[PDB]
Scaffold this motif. Structure first.
Motif, PDB file in Angstrom:
ATOM      1  N   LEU A  36      -5.179   1.360 -13.142  1.00 25.75           N
ATOM      2  CA  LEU A  36      -3.846   1.235 -12.553  1.00 25.75           C
ATOM      3  C   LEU A  36      -2.832   0.464 -13.400  1.00 25.75           C
ATOM      4  CD1 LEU A  36      -4.612   0.815  -8.749  1.00 25.75           C
ATOM      5  CD2 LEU A  36      -3.847   2.825  -9.927  1.00 25.75           C
ATOM      6  N   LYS A  37      -1.609   1.025 -13.524  1.00 26.04           N
ATOM      7  CA  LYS A  37      -0.413   0.451 -14.167  1.00 26.04           C
ATOM      8  C   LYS A  37      -0.114  -0.972 -13.622  1.00 26.04           C
ATOM      9  CE  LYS A  37       4.524   1.286 -15.083  1.00 26.04           C
ATOM     10  NZ  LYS A  37       5.757   2.090 -14.861  1.00 26.04           N
ATOM     11  N   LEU A  64       0.837  -1.181   0.000  1.00 31.48           N
ATOM     12  CA  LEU A  64       0.000   0.000   0.000  1.00 31.48           C
ATOM     13  C   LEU A  64       0.894   1.262   0.000  1.00 31.48           C
ATOM     14  CD1 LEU A  64      -2.673   1.340   0.028  1.00 31.48           C
ATOM     15  CD2 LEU A  64      -2.861   0.826   2.519  1.00 31.48           C
ATOM     16  N   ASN A  65       2.075   1.168   0.611  1.00 31.28           N
ATOM     17  CA  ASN A  65       3.055   2.256   0.652  1.00 31.28           C
ATOM     18  C   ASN A  65       3.414   2.733  -0.748  1.00 31.28           C
ATOM     19  OD1 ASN A  65       5.005   3.862   2.378  1.00 31.28           O
ATOM     20  ND2 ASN A  65       6.373   2.927   0.901  1.00 31.28           N
ATOM     21  N   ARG A  77       4.023   6.251  -4.876  1.00 37.49           N
ATOM     22  CA  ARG A  77       4.606   6.258  -6.235  1.00 37.49           C
ATOM     23  C   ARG A  77       3.600   6.958  -7.196  1.00 37.49           C
ATOM     24  NH1 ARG A  77       7.099   0.220  -7.211  1.00 37.49           N
ATOM     25  NH2 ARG A  77       8.970   0.351  -5.897  1.00 37.49           N
ATOM     26  N   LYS A  78       3.536   8.291  -7.083  1.00 38.55           N
ATOM     27  CA  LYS A  78       2.621   9.161  -7.797  1.00 38.55           C
ATOM     28  C   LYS A  78       2.829   9.235  -9.297  1.00 38.55           C
ATOM     29  CE  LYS A  78       0.832  11.428  -3.935  1.00 38.55           C
ATOM     30  NZ  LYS A  78       1.763  12.348  -3.224  1.00 38.55           N
ATOM     31  N   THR A  79       4.027   8.958  -9.817  1.00 40.11           N
ATOM     32  CA  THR A  79       4.217   9.018 -11.270  1.00 40.11           C
ATOM     33  C   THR A  79       3.708   7.709 -11.860  1.00 40.11           C
ATOM     34  OG1 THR A  79       6.515   8.353 -11.248  1.00 40.11           O
ATOM     35  CG2 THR A  79       6.078  10.741 -11.066  1.00 40.11           C
ATOM     36  N   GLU A  80       3.988   6.582 -11.170  1.00 41.94           N
ATOM     37  CA  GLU A  80       3.521   5.246 -11.553  1.00 41.94           C
ATOM     38  C   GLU A  80       2.006   5.131 -11.414  1.00 41.94           C
ATOM     39  OE1 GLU A  80       6.300   1.955  -9.731  1.00 41.94           O
ATOM     40  OE2 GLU A  80       4.549   1.067 -10.742  1.00 41.94           O
ATOM     41  N   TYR A  81       1.417   5.817 -10.416  1.00 45.40           N
ATOM     42  CA  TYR A  81      -0.022   5.806 -10.129  1.00 45.40           C
ATOM     43  C   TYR A  81      -0.555   7.233  -9.931  1.00 45.40           C
ATOM     44  CZ  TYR A  81       1.361   0.994  -8.835  1.00 45.40           C
ATOM     45  OH  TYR A  81       1.919  -0.263  -8.780  1.00 45.40           O
ATOM     46  N   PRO A  82      -0.772   8.014 -11.011  1.00 52.78           N
ATOM     47  CA  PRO A  82      -1.300   9.374 -10.822  1.00 52.78           C
ATOM     48  C   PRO A  82      -2.675   9.401 -10.132  1.00 52.78           C
ATOM     49  CG  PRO A  82      -0.501   9.036 -13.040  1.00 52.78           C
ATOM     50  CD  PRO A  82      -0.577   7.709 -12.445  1.00 52.78           C
TER      51      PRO A  82
END
Ligand code: K9T
Ligand code: K9T
Ligand code: CA
Lengths: 281, 284
Positions: free
Chosen positions: A280-281, A96-97, A102-107
């Motif tokens: 989600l990526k 979950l961290n 990881r805002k670029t991987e998951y905007p």
């Protein structure tokens, strides 16, 4: 009087053993079971000590006994003079961290999924507390909430767990110098999920965190941390604030917490969870 | 050694007890009052015979011992003078039987999902066969392959299962089991594979099941042609080969689930991850 034995896995059955991470809890590696044809995760030691050996076996017994839909499923124990580790299912979507930070991987992490994660964490911990005797996790953090292929929760790291008979940001202030520990950690996790912010981000020294929390300071609740567009914002702030209450007696049980969350989760249509995952990526 | 006890669930903890289906027992959905989760209860048809009691506790023990990623997870045993049942996780998407044959509800069941279901059935059964002693299911059918929220497989009904040391349909039963084997499950699996790829009822044209048994015993199997299995099926040749070896008249000529998995692994790698999520959203 129905009993189940935890399987023993010969080390040579763990093929493609590849390092994932290292922590205070131990080292984590991914592998594939040669006979079962499935991907697995191995939390091993990686220098031998018989005190560390007892710790791994203790954790393995707790995980075996604590089996449930929202607990990391243990597959076997790998116990050899050469190697020692707990073999579990592989969680392809990590923690979950990482999802939160990881805002670029998951905007975008849609609200339905965020609320579902929170519901499942509460379901997992409630199960632990409802065992005979109760099991208290005592080390909940966003790093320990693992996510499977469809972003369903699996609670991990049972190293500090106790039968009721690193970072300090999830620790209740009375623990510095209880059944009410996990609910405090859970309120911080809730704040972190809804904000996508690191608790006490502006605080450089963890002694400053410890001192502030001991004085009743908590992660900031405002427009910048928890935006006004959060679904059920008022109700969620109330849950968070009761969960991280200075007085442990005033913090709710996970049952009370679930009875409050159930009407919130019913507001989301089922397909919105699937749509959140496909995004989600 | 490390041991785990199966929890006992007081009947009064099972709220909203609602009938789902009845078979050779009865299945009901409920919610655990303390755990706040939906559960399924396979219980006895509400009279309590002590022979039926031993049967339930035998299956409850097999399910507890056989825990794996592709096996229906047992949550507890509900054992009372009043009531007796096996409490498991609730499978919101029902069975593989309904997915395949409810064609108006499901006009399309994408190939990736069909192959994933077949891979997971093989993973589940292979695990059973790899236990010490091996566990043999002995009653695999599309009705017993349950599907969770994301259409992941959970194998159910361990009532005829055995440790290698009145009923219904016979269409998944090998011909050697007719009159008074580790090669039983692979036969049932070949029929399931045919059923998944065709979306057809095995021996649909045959009205009497005894006529099916007479046909099967003679070497007849569900039809393999352009109409049952179209030419557009991904990996059609490889799949027909697997099906045909799986349901061979000679049990010795049938593959192990390991051989079956080693064949299926390169097929499943041809599908992109998103195609499985897309397949599931289409079904909602
Ligand atoms: C947490 C993380 C994402 C940094 S990870 O370490 O890379 C990780 C850990 C897994 C795990 N950990 C485990 C295993 C056994 C036990 S016994 C008690 N607690 C544990 C905890 N278990 C399962 N799957 C894991 C997956 C992990 O990462 C996913 C891989 O990430 P990537 O290489 O980016 O695809
Ligand atoms: C099979 C079906 C779809 C006709 S169902 O009966 O409606 C059903 C069955 C479930 C189950 N069955 C079970 C429970 C315990 C044991 S112990 C050994 N074998 C078993 C098998 N377990 C879990 N979930 C089930 C869900 C089912 O229905 C799917 C949803 O139907 P609905 O509520 O009408 O949408
Ligand atoms: Ca439809």
């Amino acid at each position: 009087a129905i009993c189940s034995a935890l399987p023993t896995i010969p080390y040579h059955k763990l093929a493609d053993l590849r390092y994932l991470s290292r922590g205070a809890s131990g080292t984590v590696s991914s592998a594939r079971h040669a006979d079962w044809r499935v991907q697995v995760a191995v939390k091993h030691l990686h220098p031998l000590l018989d005190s560390e050996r007892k710790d791994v076996l203790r954790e393995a017994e707790i995980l075996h006994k604590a089996r449930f839909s929202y607990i990391l499923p243990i597959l076997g124990i790998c116990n050899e003079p050469e190697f020692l580790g707990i073999v579990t299912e592989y969680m392809p979507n990590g923690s979950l961290n990482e999802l939160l930070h990881r805002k670029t991987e998951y905007p975008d992490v849609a609200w339905p999924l965020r609320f579902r994660i929170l519901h499942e964490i509460a379901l997992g911990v409630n199960y632990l507390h409802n065992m005979t005797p109760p099991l208290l996790h005592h080390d909940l953090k966003t790093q320990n909430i693992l996510l499977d292929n469809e972003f369903h929760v699996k609670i991990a790291d049972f190293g500090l767990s106790k039968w009721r008979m690193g970072t300090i940001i999830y620790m209740p202030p009375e623990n510095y110098e209880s059944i009410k520990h996990d609910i405090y950690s859970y309120a911080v996790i809730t704040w972190e999920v809804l904000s996508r912010k690191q608790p006490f981000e502006d605080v450089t020294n963890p002694l400053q965190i410890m001192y502030s929390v001991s004085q009743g300071h908590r992660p900031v609740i405002n427009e910048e941390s928890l935006p006004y567009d959060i679904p059920h914002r008022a109700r969620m702030i109330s849950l968070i604030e009761s969960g991280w209450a200075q007085n442990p007696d005033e913090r709710p049980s996970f049952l009370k917490c679930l009875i409050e969350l159930e009407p919130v989760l019913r507001t989301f249509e089922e397909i919105t969870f699937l749509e959140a995952v496909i995004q989600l990526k």
